[PDB]
């Protein structure tokens, strides 16, 4: 009776843990976001320089 | 006796699997983090459009 | 006795797994990250192009 209740609950948990393991691999690594943040950091910088260079040209012309 | 031994062993492996999941979870990106990066990509693309239009006029004027 | 112990550990696992599930729903998927990567691919191409144009505008004007 009580051992049965446990058997059923352990079975359910095993399935849940399996689904979580599956879902875990669909989630993105923090290392992927940091590397992307870096690239966006580079694009922040280059765009800043472009805005400066453009202003310069916009005044000469 | 037998079923209880089996249940001890299943619960032990689930505990170790669940413990592994909690450390895996910690190496994964939060959505709110991703949303702030999208906000910066939303900024940069607007600035790149604006610069494209400015450079279009400059090469025309020169 | 050993039934109590297993009843106790199961309960704790149920709560742990419920916590992991709602915590899983805060994490962003590789798909949306790949979409953001695509947009960063574009913007990096457009920046390089703009760099070329401006470098020419600079050396053409003065």
Residue numbers in the entry:
A (entry chain C): 6 to 66
B (entry chain B): 5 to 66
C (entry chain A): 6 to 67
What does the paper say about this structure?
α-Helical coiled coils are ubiquitous protein domains, found in a wide range of structural and functional contexts. The seven positions in a heptad are labeled a – g, where positions a and d are oriented towards the core of the bundle and are thus mostly hydrophobic. β-Layers are found, also repetitively, in natural coiled coils, where they form regular fibers with alternating α- and β-structure, a protein fold that has not been described so far.
The other, MATKDDIAN, is from a second family of prokaryotic coiled-coil proteins that we found to contain nonads and related periodicities; it occurs for example in 14 consecutive repeats in the protein Tcar0761 of Thermosinus carboxydivorans. From Thermosinus Tcar0761 we derived the constructs T9, with the full MATKDDIAN motif, and T6, with the shortened motif MATKDD. In A9 and in one of the T9 structures, T99, the β-layers are formed as in Actinobacillus OMP100. The middle three residues, KAD in A9, KDD in T99, form the β-layer in place of position d.
